[PDB]
Amino acid sequence: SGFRKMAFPSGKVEGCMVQVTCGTTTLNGLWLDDVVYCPRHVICTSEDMLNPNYEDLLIRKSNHNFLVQAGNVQLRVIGHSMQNCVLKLKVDTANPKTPKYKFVRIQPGQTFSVLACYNGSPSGVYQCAMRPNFTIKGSFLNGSCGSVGFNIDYDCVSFCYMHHMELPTGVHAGTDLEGNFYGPFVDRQTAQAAGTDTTITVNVLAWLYAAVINGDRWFLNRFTTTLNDFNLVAMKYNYEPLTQDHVDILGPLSAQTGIAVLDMCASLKELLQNGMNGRTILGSALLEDEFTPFDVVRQCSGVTFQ
Amino acid sequence: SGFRKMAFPSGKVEGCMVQVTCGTTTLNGLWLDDVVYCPRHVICTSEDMLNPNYEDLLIRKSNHNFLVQAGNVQLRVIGHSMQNCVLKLKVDTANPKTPKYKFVRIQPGQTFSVLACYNGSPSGVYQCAMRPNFTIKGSFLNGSCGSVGFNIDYDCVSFCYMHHMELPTGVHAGTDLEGNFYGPFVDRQTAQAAGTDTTITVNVLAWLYAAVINGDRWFLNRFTTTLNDFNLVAMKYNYEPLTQDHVDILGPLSAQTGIAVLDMCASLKELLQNGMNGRTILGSALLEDEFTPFDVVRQCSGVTFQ
Q1: Domain range spanning residue A208?
Q2: Distance of alpha carbon B251 from alpha carbon B230, whole angstroms
Q3: For residue A204, what are the CA distances in angstroms to A30, A83, A121, B5?
Q4: Residue B80 annotated in active site
Q5: For this structure, is B145 an active site residue?
C-alpha cells in the first residue's frame, strides 16, 4: 500500500560514474567498457560557451589534456572523438563494473531515474519524465553535467539521458547517449526557450487509477464520456489528446479496478472543470502526470530487479 | 537549480539485501558482517499474527528452519536470537560487501531513504520522514518487510528503519535495527491507530527557503511576526510549535537568502490563513514538510558521497 515517486536502484550506475576535467572545467562522465562518455562542452572555457565552434576547439586538444578520474584512480586516454554533442574518450582500462546495458532514445511522457553527480561522485537519485516539450524538471547544481538518466529492465540498464544544460525557466535539457538533444536545444549559452508545457493525460489517468487502488475514491462520479468529448476538454487545459493506444495501455489498470477508462476520463474532466476544492489525491492538491501506466503497475504488482 | 525529493544512492545497501524464509513466509533481511537482521514475524503463520507469543514460537525453531538466500546462493545459519522485534541470524559467511555502517535511532521530523525490496531483490528507492506520530508514508507491498531506511554520512551508512507493518490508514510502522518500534506499535495484527499527524513546521520553512533560492518568491510579504504570535497560529493547524533551535538550524538558509526566519514565518502564517489561491510553490499546491534544513542545504550546496 501507498504510492511514491520511486527511482530504480542506482547501484549498477554508481560503478560507472567518473570525473572528467579539461583545464578549469570539471564534470561527470559515464565509464562503460573502455569508453568514457561526457558532454563535449567540457572543452569550453567560460568565454567559449557564448558561440563555441566545437570542431575548432577540439583541434587544440590531445588525449593527454583529458583528466579522467575513477574514484581516486586516474585513467589513461588512448583516443578521443566527438559524436554530436558527446565526447567519447577511449581509455586503456575496461570498467570491471560495466553492467549489462543499452542506449535508448526515450519518447516524451516516458519516465526514468537520474543519478545526480558532482566530480564523478553520486549525490542522490530521483524519478523524472521527458515532458512533451522535451525538457525535464530535475535538480542539477553546477558540475551536475554528464549525470545520466536510466531505466532497469530485469538485469539490463537502459541509459536514455545525459544532462547538459538549464533553460531560463530553471528546467533542464540534455541528450541521449549518442549525443542528440531531446528537443531543439543546442549546447551554447544563448536565449533558448521551451515550447508550451502540455500535460501527459495518459499518466494523469494512471495516477487516478493508482489513487483508487490505494483507497482514495472521492473523485469517482456517476458519469462516463467519449474520447472526442474528453479531448474537447483536454485542448482547453493543454492536456495531450487521448487515443485508443492510451486506452489499451490503461486496460490492466481498468481491468484490476473494474473501472472503464472512459468513466475515469469523466472523473478527470470534472477535476479539470471544478478543480479539487482543497481535497487531495495521494497527498497531492494537483494532478500528477509523471507516472506512466508501467510505473503504476510495477508499484501495485511489486516487481524486483537482480 | 530545481528541487526534488531525492534519495541517497542505494548501491552500498543493495549489496546487503537477502531473502529470509520460514515455512511459507518470505521477507527481506539485512546482511552485515556474519549477521542477518529481519523482522521476527517471519516465524509467524497467517494464523499466529492475531496474538503471537514470539518466545514460544521461536522455541519450535532451529537454525536449519531459516532459509537465508543472497542472490542465488544459500547462506548457512549457525546461530539465531531475538532482540526486541528483530531476529539476528548468525551465518558463517561474512558479507564481503558490508559497507562501513552504524545503527541510529532517528528523531521524528528527520528524513531517510528507503530501499523497498521483494524476495531480497531491490525494487526502488525513495525519501521518507519519520512523522511526529512515528509513522511513515511509504510504498510497501506484500513481502516488502525487512526493507530498510538509511542515511549516508560521507562513506558511512546509518541504518535507522526496518519495515514491519501497515496501519488501517495505509501508513507504515517499523523498528530501528535494534528492533524497538518507533511509536507505540506492536508486531501483532490488531486494531492499532496513529495519533494526530502534526506538520513539521521547521521543514515547511526549509522548503519555503528552497523555493526562494529557486526563484519562486510570490508568497513573500511585507510582514514579520514573533515566535509566540506564529505558534498561536501553528496550534490551530496542527503544526509543531517552533523554538529557537529551529531558528538557529535555519540560520544558514536565512543567511544565504538574507531573509530573517520570522519574516518567513509571517509568509507561512499568511499561507495557513489564506491558503494558496491555486498558486504553486516548487510545483506543489500544498505545504511540503518532508525536507529538513539539512536536506535543503545539501541540494542547494551540492555535496557528494564516496
Answers
A1: 201-299
A2: 18
A3: 33, 36, 34, 20
A4: no
A5: yes
